[PDB]
Design an enzyme around this catalytic site. Structure first.
Site, mmCIF file in Angstrom:
data_model
loop_
_atom_site.group_PDB
_atom_site.id
_atom_site.type_symbol
_atom_site.label_atom_id
_atom_site.label_comp_id
_atom_site.label_asym_id
_atom_site.label_seq_id
_atom_site.Cartn_x
_atom_site.Cartn_y
_atom_site.Cartn_z
ATOM 1 N N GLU A 121 -10.558 14.178 78.031
ATOM 2 C CA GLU A 121 -11.509 13.294 77.367
ATOM 3 C C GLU A 121 -12.853 13.198 78.087
ATOM 4 O O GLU A 121 -13.897 13.069 77.451
ATOM 5 C CB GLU A 121 -10.900 11.906 77.160
ATOM 6 C CG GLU A 121 -11.388 11.214 75.900
ATOM 7 C CD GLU A 121 -10.390 10.211 75.361
ATOM 8 O OE1 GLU A 121 -9.649 9.614 76.169
ATOM 9 O OE2 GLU A 121 -10.343 10.025 74.126
ATOM 10 N N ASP A 130 -20.787 3.509 73.878
ATOM 11 C CA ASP A 130 -19.883 4.215 72.979
ATOM 12 C C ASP A 130 -20.523 4.434 71.613
ATOM 13 O O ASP A 130 -21.727 4.239 71.444
ATOM 14 C CB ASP A 130 -18.559 3.462 72.834
ATOM 15 C CG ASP A 130 -18.753 1.971 72.638
ATOM 16 O OD1 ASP A 130 -19.808 1.568 72.106
ATOM 17 O OD2 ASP A 130 -17.847 1.200 73.021
#
Ligand SMILES: COC(=O)N1CC[C@@H]2[C@H]1CCC[C@@]2(O)C#Cc1cccc(C)c1
Ligand SMILES: CCCCCCCC/C=C\CCCCCCCC(=O)O
Ligand SMILES: CCCCCCCC/C=C\CCCCCCCC(=O)O
Ligand SMILES: CCCCCCCC/C=C\CCCCCCCC(=O)O
Ligand SMILES: CCCCCCCC/C=C\CCCCCCCC(=O)O
Length: 409
Positions: A121, A130
């Protein structure tokens, strides 16, 4: 004679003897069981040498009352102090090494899953946002939800423990990751579709499942109904084939191929990813308590003041009580850390419970004993109680399984 006092109207010394006798028999029973069945997995899976030390410490704990209740000789005053001090020291200082080992093993376990998601990831050593604009750092670790960049930096310093200036390290990023892993496990255990699968898998295959959770979410992994059932029934080859057909595999093939492979072998091949020492360390911690006791024999020579009253002052009690308190405090720290660890037939759950009570016992001991006009009897019961608790919670459930349930073994 303990019978005389019992017949004069005082059942205290006779009770402590019976308590101590029943304890010795119990400890004798347990040890013999562990000797005969030493090769059984329930005894083999733990450090057997450490258990012997713990069982020896408890035995001396019951033997302590025979020095507190004895004919008035000089050396019994010596045996009292060397017993009340060293007997918990033998148990807890051997138990701390057991728990500390369980803590490092668990920490090393979280180390692998961290390196797994670092590769799958990614990671950012400085603050970012984000897909929804919330301040984030590391491997998708949410810091705060305020638009304030200042707010994120404050939350980061409290989590790390220093002035970071919006920049952390790999080790510090793993710390934040350990929280998100635990939170993910919390969610899995509260999901009816994911809970049974998570419980059936080994340590490695559980990380591969959490990997999928951190990519698609819980409501996404639950969509792999057929595949999850295959994994639960330990049908790895069928699970891999079934997973390789999914949209998930066809959308992110590079990452999915590694996760699937981890389900197959139950190893970390897809990713680049001591017993003798424990006895020595346990031995060292016991000798520290002995050095304290020997020193106090020199500073304050023990002398005779059924009941055997010695001239042991507060300092002769406080110092070894304080050191034992640290051993207890250290044990609880690691035992609470490894409370959910399922190794050795859920062993650690029983270990943590013992340390919870022992802390209460120790804490209660201070105002009770030092305010008491019946110190000898209150010392007999106290030592015999905390010895019984350690014997009843840690050893009995293992003896039960070994004698009542050999098929479970
Ligand atoms: C110098 O006095 C002390 O250090 N203490 C006084 C009472 C005693 C101890 C500290 C903790 C609580 C205690 O009650 C005990 C104990 C114990 C003894 C043998 C085996 C096991 C598992 C526990
Ligand atoms: C059941 C097992 C009981 C075993 C031991 C009980 C011990 C009784 C001894 C107390 C009397 C000794 C004495 O006062 O002289
Ligand atoms: C069973 C074996 C022993 C139980 C009785 C032990 C009695 C301890 C003696 C205490 C005293 O006499 O002061
Ligand atoms: C570990 C402790 C190291 C050395 C022990 C020295 C022996 C001293 C004991 C003194 C007892 C006494 O005579 O009062
Ligand atoms: C759960 C246990 C954690 C606490 C450990 C703390 C260690 C502190 C060390 C020694 C405390 C001993 C208390 C003795 C106070 C003296 C009382 C008196 O003189 O009557």
């Amino acid at each position: 004679s303990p019978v005389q006092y019992l017949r004069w109207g005082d059942p205290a010394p006779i009770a402590a003897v019976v308590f101590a006798c029943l304890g010795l028999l119990a400890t004798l029973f347990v040890t013999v069981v562990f000797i005969i069945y030493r090769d059984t997995p329930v005894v083999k899976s733990s450090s057997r040498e450490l258990c012997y030390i713990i069982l020896a410490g408890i035995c001396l704990g019951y033997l302590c009352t025979f020095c507190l209740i004895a004919k008035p000789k000089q050396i019994y005053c010596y045996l009292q102090r060397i017993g009340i001090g060293l007997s918990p020291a033998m148990s807890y200082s051997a138990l701390v090494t057991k728990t500390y080992r369980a803590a490092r093993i668990l920490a090393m376990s979280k180390k692998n899953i961290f390196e797994m998601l670092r590769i799958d990831e990614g990671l950012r050593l400085k603050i970012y946002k984000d897909t929804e604009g919330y301040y984030t750092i590391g491997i998708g670790h949410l810091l705060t939800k305020s638009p304030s960049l200042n707010a994120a930096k404050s939350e980061l310093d409290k989590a790390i423990g220093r002035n970071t200036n919006g920049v952390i390290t790999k080790d510090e990023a793993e710390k934040l990751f350990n929280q998100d892993v635990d939170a993910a496990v919390r969610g899995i255990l509260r999901n009816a579709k994911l809970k049974p699968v998570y419980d059936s898998l080994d340590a490695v295959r559980r990380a591969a499942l959490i990997n999928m959770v951190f990519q698609m979410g819980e409501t996404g992994v639950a969509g792999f109904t057929n595949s999850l059932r295959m994994l639960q029934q330990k049908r790895w080859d069928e699970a891999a084939v079934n997973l390789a057909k999914s949209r998930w595999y066809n959308q992110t093939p590079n990452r999915a191929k590694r996760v699937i492979t981890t389900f197959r072998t139950g190893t970390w091949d897809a990713y680049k990813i001591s017993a003798c020492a424990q006895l020595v360390i346990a031995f060292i911690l016991i000798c520290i308590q002995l050095g304290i006791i020997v020193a106090l024999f020199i500073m304050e020579p023990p002398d005779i003041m059924v009941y055997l009253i010695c001239n042991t002052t507060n300092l002769g009690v406080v110092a070894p009580l304080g050191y034992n308190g640290l051993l207890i405090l250290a044990c609880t720290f690691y035992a609470f850390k490894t409370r959910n660890v399922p190794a050795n037939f859920n062993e650690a759950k029983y270990i943590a419970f013992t340390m919870y009570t022992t802390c209460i016992i120790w804490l209660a001991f201070v105002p009770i004993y030092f305010g008491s006009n019946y110190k000898i009897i209150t010392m007999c019961f106290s030592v015999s109680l905390s010895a019984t608790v350690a014997l009843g919670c840690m050893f009995v459930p293992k003896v039960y399984i070994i004698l009542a349930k050999p098929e479970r073994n």
